[PDB]
Amino acid sequence: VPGKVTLQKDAQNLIGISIGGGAQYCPCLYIVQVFDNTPAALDGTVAAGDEITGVNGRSIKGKTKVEVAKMIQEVKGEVTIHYNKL
Amino acid sequence: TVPGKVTLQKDAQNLIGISIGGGAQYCPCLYIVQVFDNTPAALDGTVAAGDEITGVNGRSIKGKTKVEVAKMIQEVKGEVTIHYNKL
Ligand SMILES: O=C(O)[C@H](CC1CC1)NC(=O)C1(c2ccc(Br)cc2)CCN(Cc2ccccc2C(F)(F)F)CC1
Ligand SMILES: O=C(O)[C@H](CC1CC1)NC(=O)C1(c2ccc(Br)cc2)CCN(Cc2ccccc2C(F)(F)F)CC1
């Protein structure tokens, strides 16, 4: 089930997630942790184990975790995360 | 990638306290998604959300679906060894 959610960045330019995946032999990218009291956590749409498929209308295919973390961090104010629900 | 393994004691409900992810047509890798509170896996402390699972009791999970991996884990009674790569 695909989905998208726009999250407002906190004062430290974070949404509040950890990610995993996007390595050799393991292409897919996932939300690993959603931290308490962050935008992601308080929105409630995303959760551990949902698959990250895009950021602000662009695919994360082929990208590494550092790469995707930068794709998110570059985007100020708010960011849309495109996902598949576990 | 830091490989390891851990033998966990099954609870009275034949559980270790984990849910898992991946194991899919185009995302072949399998992961631990959640470690539930007050379970063998949570009380042991070795494994955590995001660790990749590579095998169960000396056998690989390569190519299996998550329902198959859950069945593999459930069939072993008493204790089971989870081979993993650490996040
Ligand atoms: O929350 C973001 O907007 C981003 C998003 C990117 C996609 C991970 N998260 C991060 O920058 C971090 C990260 C993780 C993996 C990689 Br690979 C890279 C970067 C994860 C979150 N922390 C801080 C953290 C630390 C401990 C508890 C809570 C928090 C906090 F987030 F502040 F709530 C900084 C690094
Ligand atoms: O803990 C296990 O030993 C196994 C291991 C298998 C590989 C997931 N886990 C499971 O049986 C479940 C499962 C998940 C995904 C698939 Br795909 C299939 C099965 C997850 C754990 N629950 C019970 C659960 C539910 C809610 C709160 C707590 C708990 C409890 F486990 F008691 F902590 C039963 C189903």
Numbering used by the authors:
A (entry chain A): 19 to 104
B (entry chain B): 18 to 104
What do the study authors state?
The C-terminus of the GluA2 subunit binds to the PDZ domain of the scaffolding PICK1 protein, an interaction that is required for AMPA receptor internalization and long term depression. Aβ produces synaptic depression by enhancing the internalization of AMPA receptors through a GluA2-dependent mechanism resulting in a reduction in the number of dendritic spines. Multiple compounds from this series were found to show a similar increase in surface GluA2 levels. These findings demonstrate that PICK1 normally functions to transport GluA2-containing AMPA receptors intracellularly, and when PICK1 is absent, the intracellular GluA2-containing receptors are released to the neuronal surface. In this study, we report the strategic use of a high throughput screen (HTS) followed by structure based drug design in combination with an array of biochemical and cellular assays in the identification of a novel, selective, and potent series of PICK1-GluA2 PDZ inhibitors.
